[PDB]
Paper text:
The mammalian TRPC subfamily consists of seven transmembrane proteins (TRPC1-7) that have been proposed to form non-selective cation channels in various cell types. [name] and its most close homologs TRPC3 and TRPC7 are unique among the TRPCs in that they can be directly activated by second messenger diacylglycerol (DAG), a product of phospholipase C action. [name]-mediated cation influx regulates physiological function of pulmonary endothelial cells, smooth muscle cells and glomerular podocytes, whereas [name] hyperactivity has been implicated in maladaptive tissue and organ remodeling. In this study, we present two high-resolution cryo-EM structures of antagonist- and agonist-bound human [name] in lipidic nanodiscs.
Furthermore, because [name] V867T/L868T, like WT, responded to both AM-0883 and OAG but exhibited much higher channel activity than WT, the double mutant appeared to be an ideal variant for us to investigate the more activated state of [name]. We found a clear non-protein density at each subunit interface that represents the agonist AM-0883, which consists of a chloro-indole, a piperidine and a benzodioxin, and occupies a groove between S6 of one subunit and the pore helix of the adjacent subunit. The agonist forms hydrophobic interactions with Phe675 and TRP680 on the pore helix and Tyr705, Val706 and Val710 on S6. There are also possible hydrophilic interactions between the indole ring and Glu672 and Asn702. We tested whether mutations around this region would affect the potency of the agonist and found that mutations F675A, W680A, N702A, Y705A and V710A almost completely abolished the channel activity in the presence of the agonist AM-0883, whereas mutations E672A and V706A showed a 35-fold and 20-fold increase in agonist EC50, respectively. Notably, the AM-0883-binding site faces membrane lipids and is occupied by one of the outer leaflet lipids in the antagonist-bound structure, and therefore constitutes a likely location for DAG-binding at the outer leaflet. However, similar to the antagonist-bound structure of [name] (Δ2–72), the agonist-bound structure of [name] (Δ2–72) V867T/L868T also possesses a closed ion channel pore. Instead, the presence of the agonist seems to tilt the extracellular half of S6 away from the pore and pushes S6 toward the intracellular side. Because S6 is tightly packed against S1-S4 of the adjacent subunit, the movement of S6 is accompanied by a concurrent tilting and downward movement of S1-S4 as well as the S4-S5 linker.
Residue numbers in the entry:
A (entry chain A): 85 to 194, 203 to 433
B (entry chain A): 733 to 767, 853 to 920
C (entry chain B): 883 to 920
D (entry chain D): 853 to 882
E (entry chain B): 85 to 134
F (entry chain D): 335 to 383
Write the structure that this text describes.
């Protein structure tokens, strides 16, 4: 004889009619009951715990959303923003960001029950800001819009933090703190945030992949998530190398700023970034053909005749170096910088 | 192991062997050793990456929430059109009958 | 492709609402102009 | 008490996540 | 404090309105702003470069 | 889908106000013994447990 009973009451006819009109897209009924009805509560709630703005946002109703957003006593505006960000509705997000509560970008990044969707609880975790949720959901236009208003993902501290803010957070709850750290890293390790947040995303994604790789070993619990985040940080750089068309684009992905770097010992390029990619074990970045052709041209290096030969040819040359080894030794000692040196 | 990872591993090992010889330190076998534009290119590549990422998410399968969004579009369009036809008919009708009682 | 269907529905909605609006108003001004004649 | 409140909150989270999961299912021709 | 910034400026209201009308299929608004507006640049550009 | 410590302790353990606290400061392990008895292996192999 038990039921869930998320409202524990019954609605009126002028409230069930308004909620059905808001849910199913009946724009003139909603307009008439907002203009010519004064004994109605706009914040009347469904059987499950949803008011009319949440039914309008959850069903992609832009006209009802823009019509409800001029009432100046609506509840659950931050939850409607989070639901529209998670579902991917760019026009509803741009309509909700014109409300006079996100006026100066006040509540887009970094208690007040603003993002609650019921009497008790938020839809996502309490640390999840709009920018973190937009980076989780790979929404490039919403991420660009939220970065345009000055919202950033705050980088979490080290695992052995002992500050006045790490200690009370870890003493209050040792589960929510680790979940908050992994949510911030899942936000930071996304291609939508990596491509739009920094000015050099290759170096940022390489260092972030290394940081998540060592954090997978420090925290033995929740390791299969840090490994996944590091793998997608590597996949970002590999996918950025794949869409290269010229030689200067390949040399800007594989090597850094070639005007502000040392050219090297010889006419070969500056190999400082590929050493870092081998150190961080980004294997598909090094096994990619655009890297393989450059490494082959450095590897051969004034033997282009022996490049196209066969393996039967490259056994006789090894035996020739085996016979005449002191000869090449003393001409390397006594006369460098020659045709053979 | 996957098929593409059996080749990626060998190419990574061969490239580590290659970088073991790019350094100018050894230079001899073992018995004998005892004696601006970048910002422009990165902006272009980031724009290519974002367009290709939007193409790749457009190549993803259709789930049933998106078809429900199409259904709600059709239903709200139906409500708007039926109310527009109703209000046009009635608001024309009262003024035409008000000029019809004049004769 | 479903986004292409959605844009078809949205452009159809814009065309139909503007057609109903222009039909109502352009009928209304001439009927009131013949309504001031009596 | 508190346990009934926590279980009500968790059952509501489960039902919303289950509706999300059935919305992430493929489209058939009906 | 960095952003991609593919246009590095801000649009007018008569340009954002025209771009939204061109994107979302608002044919009569596009027709009216092509027939009865002379201070508009048809080649006005979006946030992304379109 | 548990976020706090009290939600994890309400799923893994029962009503902690109406249960015996245990021999020491450890929680009441009566439900996890039942989950091991009924061989609910992913409930016990879950990281929150």
């Amino acid at each position: 004889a038990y039921m869930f009973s998320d409202r524990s009451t019954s609605l009126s006819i002028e409230e069930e009619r308004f909620l059905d009109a808001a849910e199913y897209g009946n724009i003139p009924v909603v307009r008439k009951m907002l203009e010519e009805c004064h004994s109605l509560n706009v914040n009347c709630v469904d059987y499950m715990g949803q008011n009319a703005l949440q039914l309008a946002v959850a069903n992609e109703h832009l006209e009802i959303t823009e019509l409800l957003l001029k009432k100046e006593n609506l509840s659950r505006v931050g939850d409607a923003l989070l639901l529209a960000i998670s579902k991917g509705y760019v026009r509803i997000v741009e309509a909700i960001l014109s409300h006079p509560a996100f006026a100066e970008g006040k509540r887009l990044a970094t208690q007040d029950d603003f993002y609650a969707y019921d009497e008790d609880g938020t839809r996502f975790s309490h640390d999840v800001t709009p920018i973190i949720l937009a980076a989780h959901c790979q929404e490039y236009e919403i991420v660009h819009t939220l970065l345009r208003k000055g919202a950033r993902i705050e980088r979490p501290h080290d695992y052995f933090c002992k500050c006045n803010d790490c200690n009370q957070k870890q003493k209050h709850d040792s589960f929510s703190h680790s979940r908050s750290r992994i949510n911030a890293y899942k936000g930071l390790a996304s291609p939508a945030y990596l491509s739009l947040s920094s000015e050099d995303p290759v170096m940022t994604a390489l260092e972030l992949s290394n940081e998540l790789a060592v954090l997978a070993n420090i925290e033995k619990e929740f390791k299969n998530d840090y490994k996944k985040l590091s793998m997608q940080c590597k996949d970002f750089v590999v996918g950025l190398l794949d869409l290269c068309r010229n030689t200067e684009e390949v040399e800007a992905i594989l090597n850094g700023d070639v005007e502000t770097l040392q050219s090297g010992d010889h006419g070969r390029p500056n190999l400082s970034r590929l050493k870092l990619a081998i150190k961080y074990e980004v294997k598909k970045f090094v096994a990619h053909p655009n890297c393989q052709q450059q490494l082959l041209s450095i590897w051969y290096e004034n033997l282009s005749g022996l490049r196209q030969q066969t393996m039967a040819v490259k056994f006789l040359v090894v035996l020739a170096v085996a016979i005449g080894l002191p000869f090449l030794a003393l001409i390397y000692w006594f006369a460098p910088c020659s045709k053979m040196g | 192991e996957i098929e593409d990872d059996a080749d990626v591993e060998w190419k990574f090992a061969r490239a580590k062997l290659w970088f073991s010889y790019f350094e100018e330190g050894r230079t001899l076998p073992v018995p004998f050793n005892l004696v601006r534009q970048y910002q422009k290119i990165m902006k272009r590549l980031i724009k290519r990456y974002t367009t290709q990422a939007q193409i790749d998410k457009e190549s993803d399968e259709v789930n049933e929430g998106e078809l429900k969004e199409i259904k709600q579009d059709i239903s709200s369009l139906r409500y708007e059109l039926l109310e527009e036809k109703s209000q046009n008919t009635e608001d024309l009708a009262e003024l035409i009958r008000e000029l019809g009682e004049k004769l």
